[PDB]
């Protein structure tokens, strides 16, 4: 029955987007890095994983054999338009995740050997689906058990509108129907019919098979492999940001906040000596907050930063851009347990008044969005980095920065010191699932990780 199936959709999405995908995207967003004394995530850190590494095979199966199949069954089993609306929104989000990883995705033929549609085709289709499902709402309430919004239809509408905001911006910055999507995005923000709170699955317990999936994999089935990465530490330390203490531990060697250069683990050991670059010399990622931590689909902070971006870029409305910016920073301060301390940066290093040009203001928005997605929604962080290209890629190599840290601009990304990409640069996509290669001859030919997804054109 639909009631028994519908909860599995978001559970399955959460397992992927909050677990395996969240994990590798945090390396690509340069929040964290491989602890010196272990090797579990070397190939993610150094961009040396390949299609055979199967880095997203589990997530692909749980998204398509799990979440999307469950959504198909709900849509077959209920006429309740509000339930169909929520289901269609989750279905759209699953496709959005997949497209943001491999660009192409099974869609028109999904759910044998389906063809993989182009990501632009998928974005267009799922947006049309949300539109149609919304228009079919008749005012009656939901019937399915809804751990995300407790059957609150206005919230599901807000989620749909936030996903529209996210995806319209990607058309705009892909220069695809940019004029049209700009008008749609301006209207969306003017209507201000977004969600309150965060969009999250929040039922995780510190018990066997009930923990947050990222915590479960990395702190229970593994010993902790994550240390903080140099860009995040540098930026939080530079901006005097008290959120440096949330999810990041001071070094045991000296009680300092220390981030490892991306892909730089083996080089630190080489340059400094292996005995002088141990786990105690770098900031651990703190797993103690993770066991019961929700899985995020859409944070309020991100939503506000996207609204701020729209006001700054398309309305030329500085006052509403500042309000949404500060709202975003304020919300993230609250979620991390620092409510009321947001002025430490809103009246300090990251004050809107201190930014003069639109570029300076957009940098604030983009940098503060990136901070807010750390330990919340890494997949989205990696996507927003790819779309906006902010934080900017440092002009200096990891070795140059290690040799003379004064050249570095805190918060800029750093191409991994060891970098398996033949072209160098940042990771632009994930490989096609190996299971798809083995079972579906229509799976697009593999391309290097430097080949961008369709909406990433610069
Ligand atoms: Ca880009």
What's the gap in Å between 22 CA and the centre of ligand 1?
A: 19
* Residue 458 assigned to a binding site: yes
Q: Helix, strand, or coil here: 447?
A: coil
What's the gap in Å between 456 CA and the centre of ligand 1?
A: 5
CA–CA distance, 337 with 334 (Å, rounded to integer): 5
What's the gap in Å between 453 CA and the centre of ligand 1?
A: 9
Tokens of 19: 């677990």
Tokens of 357: 């040009």
Method for structure elucidation = X-ray
Residue for token pair 């993989």: 116
Tokens of 349: 């290093």
What's phi and psi for 337, nearest 5 deg?
90, 25
What's the gap in Å between 387 CA and the centre of ligand 1?
A: 5
* Residue 456 assigned to a binding site: yes
CA–CA distance, 324 with 314 (Å, rounded to integer): 14
CA–CA distance, 195 with 179 (Å, rounded to integer): 26
Beta bridge partners of 393: 413
* Residue 250 assigned to a binding site: no
Q: At what angle do helices 153-173 and 178-191 cross, to 10 degrees?
A: 150
Helix extents (H) in 136-229: 153-173, 178-191, 213-215
What's the gap in Å between 457 CA and the centre of ligand 1?
A: 6
DSSP state for residue 202 in the 8-state scheme: -
* Residue 389 assigned to a binding site: yes
Question: Which residues have CB atoms below 5 A from the ion given as ligand 1?
Answer: 386, 389, 456, 458
Q: What resolution in angstrom units was achieved for this structure?
A: 1.9
Rounded to the nearest 10°, the torsion over CA 265, 267, 269, 271 is -150
What's the gap in Å between 382 CA and the centre of ligand 1?
A: 10
What's the gap in Å between 149 CA and the centre of ligand 1?
A: 33
What's the gap in Å between 252 CA and the centre of ligand 1?
A: 37
Q: Which CATH number fits domain 1-458: 3.30.450.20, 3.40.1350.10, 1.25.40.390, 3.90.650.10?
A: 1.25.40.390
CA–CA distance, 27 with 49 (Å, rounded to integer): 13
């Amino acid at each position: 029955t639909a009631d028994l199936i519908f909860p599995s959709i978001s559970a399955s999405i959460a397992s992927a987007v909050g677990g395996e995908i969240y994990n590798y995207a945090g390396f690509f967003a340069q929040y964290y890095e491989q602890k010196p004394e272990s090797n579990q995530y070397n190939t993610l850190c150094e961009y040396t994983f390949t299609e055979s590494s199967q880095q997203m095979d589990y997530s692909y199966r749980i998204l398509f054999a799990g979440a999307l199949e469950d959504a198909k069954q709900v849509l077959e089993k209920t006429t309740n338009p509000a339930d169909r609306f929520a289901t269609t929104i989750l279905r759209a989000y699953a496709f959005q995740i997949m497209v943001d990883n491999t660009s192409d995705s099974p869609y028109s033929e999904a759910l044998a050997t389906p063809k993989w549609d182009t990501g632009e085709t998928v974005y267009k289709g799922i947006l049309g689906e949300i539109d149609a499902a919304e228009a079919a709402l008749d005012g009656s309430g939901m019937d399915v058990p809804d751990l995300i919004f407790n059957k609150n239809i206005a919230q599901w509408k807000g989620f749909a509108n936030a996903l529209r905001l996210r995806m319209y911006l990607r058309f705009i910055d892909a220069n695809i129907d940019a004029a049209s999507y700009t008008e749609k995005v301006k209207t969306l923000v003017q209507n201000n019919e977004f969600f309150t709170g965060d969009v999250k699955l929040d039922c995780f317990l510190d018990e066997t098979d009930k923990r947050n999936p990222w915590y479960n994999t990395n702190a229970v089935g593994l010993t902790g492999n994550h240390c903080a990465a140099y860009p995040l530490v540098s930026y939080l330390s530079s901006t005097g940001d008290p959120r440096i203490a949330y999810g990041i531990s001071k070094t045991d060697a000296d009680g300092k906040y220390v981030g490892q250069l991306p892909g730089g683990k083996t080089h630190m050991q080489s340059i400094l000596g292996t005995d002088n670059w141990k786990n105690k010399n770098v900031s651990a990622i703190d797993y103690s907050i993770g066991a019961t931590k929700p899985v995020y689909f859409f944070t309020q902070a991100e939503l506000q930063f996207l609204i701020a971006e729209v006001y700054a870029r398309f309305h030329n409305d500085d006052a509403n851009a500042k309000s949404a910016y500060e709202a975003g920073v304020t919300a993230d301060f609250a979620v991390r347990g620092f409510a009321g301390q947001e002025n430490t940066i809103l009246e300090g290093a990251c004050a809107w008044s201190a930014a003069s040009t639109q570029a300076d203001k957009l940098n604030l928005i983009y940098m503060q969005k990136w901070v807010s997605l750390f330990y919340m929604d890494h997949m989205e962080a990696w996507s927003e980095i790819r779309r906006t290209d902010c934080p900017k890629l440092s002009s200096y190599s990891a070795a140059q920065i290690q040799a003379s840290e004064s050249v570095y601009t805190p918060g800029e990304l750093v191409a991994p010191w060891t970098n398996g990409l033949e072209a160098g640069g940042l990771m632009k996509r994930m490989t096609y699932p190996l299971s798809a290669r083995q079972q579906n001859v229509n799976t697009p030919a593999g391309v290097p990780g430097s080949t961008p997804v369709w909406w990433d054109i610069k």
